[PDB]
Amino acid sequence: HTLVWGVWVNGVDQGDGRNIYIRSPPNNNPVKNLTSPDMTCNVDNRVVPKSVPVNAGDTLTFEWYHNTRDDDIIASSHHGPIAVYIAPAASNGQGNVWVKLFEDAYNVTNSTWAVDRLITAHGQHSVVVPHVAPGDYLFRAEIIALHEADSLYSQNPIRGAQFYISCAQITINSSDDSTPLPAGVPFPGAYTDSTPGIQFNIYTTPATSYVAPPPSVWSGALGGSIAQVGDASLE
């Protein structure tokens, strides 16, 4: 159970984004139904009044939280991967539009899942804004918690992989559009019951064997990481 509080750009807090520039759902409950429209931008997908201005090469940092800002972030039981996608705002997330900018699942040398590291990072994980066409975008951050993903939701609706999905309205101002945005995938649609990484048993299978759901990260993606960039408590 987790939600996005807001974002930072180049290490500078853009302020509380909830229902402002984040298309916030009313609570931190997971989405589980892979075929639901809720998979796109969670259960209250609508245009919110602000969109965060950025330029290509900027560092865009999502900040997540559990109940209050900079708390325990997400329950440590929720081991799983983290991905970030982008689509043009004109789509409203419909169609084959989502392009993957970041993937992190399991890190063998630290023996930590992405979620484990997110907690350590005070909820913060980042992407570098790519050289796409200037305009309005949705950046869709997705945490998948696997602690009940030995079952499929389609078969047993009280279990299944849990998706914490958040869409930020982002305006890209300065960019040379030298890596124009390619073909992406649909949500809902990309993840099905057979997709690698959707059904997995974290209690018996080694994490080193885990493969995250495709698609793979776009070659045009400029970077990213799970790591605290800013100290919320200083505000």
CA dihedral of residues 172, 173, 179, 184 (deg, nearest 10): 20
Strand partners, 104: 82
**Residues found in the chain:** 235
Report if residue 35 touches ligand NAG, rule: CB under 6 A: yes
Contact pattern for ligand NAG over residues 157 through 176, marking x by CB under 6 A: x-------------------
Residues that bind Cl ion (CB under 5 A): 31-33, 50-51, 56, 68-69, 121, 126, 175-176, 224-225, 227-228
Q: Which is nearer to ligand NAG, 40 or 59 (CB)?
A: 40
Nearest alpha-carbon partner for 66 in 11, 122, 13, 21 = 122
Range in contact with Cu ion (rule: CB under 5 A) among 1-9, 33-41, 47-55, 119-127: 1-9
Q: Which is nearer to ligand NAG, 35 or 67 (CB)?
A: 35
Strands 52-54 and 162-172: parallel
Q: Which is nearer to Cl ion, 136 or 211 (CB)?
A: 136
Minimum distance from CB of 224 to Cu ion (Å)? 24
Structure tokens at 20: 């402002």
Q: Which is nearer to Cl ion, 80 or 224 (CB)?
A: 224
Phi, psi of 232 (to 5 degrees): -55, -45
